[PDB]
Amino acid sequence: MGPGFDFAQAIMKKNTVIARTEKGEFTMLGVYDRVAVIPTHASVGEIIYINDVETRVLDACALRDLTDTNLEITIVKLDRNQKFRDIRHFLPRCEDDYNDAVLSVHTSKFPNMYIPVGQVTNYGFLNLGGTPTHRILMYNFPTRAGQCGGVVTTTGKVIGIHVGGNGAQGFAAMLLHSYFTD
Amino acid sequence: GPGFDFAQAIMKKNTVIARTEKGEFTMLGVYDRVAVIPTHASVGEIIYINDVETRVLDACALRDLTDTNLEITIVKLDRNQKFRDIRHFLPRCEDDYNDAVLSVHTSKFPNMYIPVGQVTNYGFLNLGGTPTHRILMYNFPTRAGQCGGVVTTTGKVIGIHVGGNGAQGFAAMLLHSYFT
């Protein structure tokens, strides 16, 4: 509807796949080459479904900060026959707050979904489903089941992936450029 | 929920891309060759529908019996295709709603679905300096363009997006009596 949605759409149309694990269907952001991200609670194993195709997982790494605290991001390398457009230049280098973000989801249940979530706070620490978690972004929108893995963008920046909510607020794990140095 | 199925079913058969002098708008076809578009689209004698030059036979800028703007223009189009009749999904009365979806369809934003959630019967709004009635309101914390879109709940087509103030978004109510 506006330039925020434009950037979100451009990310969705080229840099997402539908990932299925034993714990459900997730929006999954491809970052570069055969490397994607997904919430750690998806419990990625040795095999994953990518757009309903059985795919071997070459590597998966649940990220933690240097205090050994959960970040809720898993980086997956897929045995896929095609690379993603390299979007690493759209990742922020530092922890930050943002104005006017969009949360975008694409699953069987929620195809082509885009939500203007407004201001995003650098929230920091969250007890997420009982697990201490760092580098959380917060937005005041009542997100729901089915949105985990959804991409949070501003114009020109891909800043996080949706990992949870409390009914009134939604929460995303930060994406930082430094996670995807090769 | 089934809200998303409903929004897609309305989009697929009843939503077309309309282009006026002002650019592109999501247009809802209601029945026969009758459709609606925001009044601010400035519909002329000719309009493009899915990139086809189309004569507009009639255009009515709706006002209520207080003689107040409603910001809906009803158009009758000179085209062969007939819209699937959806008048039975239009509310009879003014109401509040939960769990609404706004569905956008332009050349730039094809098939885009925006869950807006809770929708209030807001009522009176000074829209661009024009007093307007029968406005629905939802959170919309962005500055959107003009193109608008169709607002649905499960089982109902309730309004078309007509504007916003950067925090809130506003739709004009669709009522069954407008098309009787």
Curated annotation (Swiss-Prot), chain A:
Catalytic activity: Selective cleavage of Gln-|-Gly bond in the poliovirus polyprotein. In other picornavirus reactions Glu may be substituted for Gln, and Ser or Thr for Gly
Entry annotation: catalytic residues: 41 (for protease 3c activity), 72 (for protease 3c activity), 148 (for protease 3c activity)
Signal peptide positions on this chain: none
Record localization: Host cytoplasm
Domain Peptidase C3: from-to ranges: 2-180
Superkingdom of the organism of origin: Viruses
Free-text function comment from the UniProt entry: Major viral protease that mediates proteolytic processing of the polyprotein. Cleaves host EIF5B, contributing to host translation shutoff. Also cleaves host PABPC1, contributing to host translation shutoff. Binds and inhibits host IFIH1/MDA5, thereby inhibiting the type-I IFN production and the establishment of the antiviral state. Cleaves host MAP3K7/TAK1, resulting in inhibition of TRAF6-triggered NF-kappa-B induction. Cleaves host TICAM1; this interaction allows the virus to disrupt host TLR3 signaling. Cleaves host IRF7, resulting in inhibition of type-I IFN production.
Subunit field text: Interacts with host IFIH1/MDA5; this interaction inhibits host IFIH1.
Name of this protein: Protease 3C
Organism: Human enterovirus D68 (EV68)
Classification lineage: Viruses, Riboviria, Orthornavirae, Pisuviricota, Pisoniviricetes
Residues of the full protein shown: 1549 to 1729 of 2188
